[PDB]
Protein: aminoglycoside 3'-PHOSPHOTRANSFERASE
Amino acid sequence: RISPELKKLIEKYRCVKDTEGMSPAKVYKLVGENENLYLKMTDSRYKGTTYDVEREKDMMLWLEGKLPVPKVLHFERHDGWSNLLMSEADGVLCSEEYEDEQSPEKIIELYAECIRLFHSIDISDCPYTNSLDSRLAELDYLLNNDLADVDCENWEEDTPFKDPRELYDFLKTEKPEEELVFSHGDLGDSNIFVKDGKVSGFIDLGRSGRADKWYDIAFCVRSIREDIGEEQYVELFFDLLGIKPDWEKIKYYILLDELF
Amino acid sequence: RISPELKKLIEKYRCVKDTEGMSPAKVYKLVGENENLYLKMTDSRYKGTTYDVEREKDMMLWLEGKLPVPKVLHFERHDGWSNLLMSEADGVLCSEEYEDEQSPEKIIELYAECIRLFHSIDISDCPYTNSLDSRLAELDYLLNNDLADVDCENWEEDTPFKDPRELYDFLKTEKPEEELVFSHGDLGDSNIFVKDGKVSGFIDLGRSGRADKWYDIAFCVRSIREDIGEEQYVELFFDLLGIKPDWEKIKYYILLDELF
Structure:
């Protein structure tokens, strides 16, 4: 599981199963009476893919001094397992503030701020590229070893394909044009941390790296539609951002995130 | 995994991995643009134990009209799997409101309200009893099939035992006296839902049932110590509740929850 050294440490804290935005990786929230810690674990099967936490560790260190991210405290490979121990995010989780009526406006602005914040990051010597060909290779790999989701298959409703392979082949042919910017890779309203109306924290950074701009833009739109049914805020978000919706690309990215 | 019928349904919603207070069971948060749903799954290995969701389903239905709980929408046994589909909790999650300075008082009162709310439930024809002998049998079973936690072993720090068996044998001998009341079984500051300062929701109800009073009282104390370092609020909680701390029993229950 974990090296003795780390085993010895995490036990001072209460340690509790995953309660935040997490997916394949095992995740533990360490509860101290003073502060909190987060232990994240992925094995070897997911090595190399955007799931492997070692990738997240790499991106987490790089992004230091650029975007507000948590701090790396411990990272090791143990018995074929990548383990990351990082501190806690800075501030308040954005996910809690939309269950009411008067408030949508401010959210959009955070999404706006988040987006231009990435377009300002010098992606020159960036550690990883999450180009379509990169992901399409990655996805192919997962499907080849049943490392996917047979459970909820979102495509079945959205598209007319039965098995993943097809939606895969379809996406490989519809693969659009890319323009590389800093992409969060999995931008959800539960990875962003607010502090006095200003973005102050980011987490779940395994799919971070270079990737077409529209990618993140597609995720923002998705949240908007769910957390606020009014399609008018989608214009506002696109108005604040000042770019014209490339509707075809947005849809393209919404479909990709269903296979994962 | 799931019956076709249910498969067909959950796919209208976005479906996302567990993001709330959950542990062994697979959990999916269904995100609709109108409302949310929660799919919970445990297989057969955990059948009968306080982990099996079928137990939670049973307690969830019983508690109807007593405590504010979510509603049952679908429950089935499929390929040796207990699956529960329930609506969303009522209100705001109590977990978000203690990261600041001026606010501890109100929390204690909620814990106070939560506690007397259980002591008011007619546990006569209650579905299940989570007496110590019941749990001690249950725990023995888990350890016998490595169905425990080798990862974080909280006891190692708190007690002087190396392997679970010992802490098990120790607890079986120190097993105190019981006085049966309605116990939530896993009362955390992330299972309680607030609405206008009044308790309005409860979840994670698999360990619900008849069990010594002090049990829940031990969990409340634990949160207090973590989310608020001041040991003075522990007096207040015990003052509002008007009972004298049976310190030995409290500790006894804090240790039990470490093996699970």
Q: What stands out?
A: Residues 104-118 of chain B form the longest helix (15 residues).
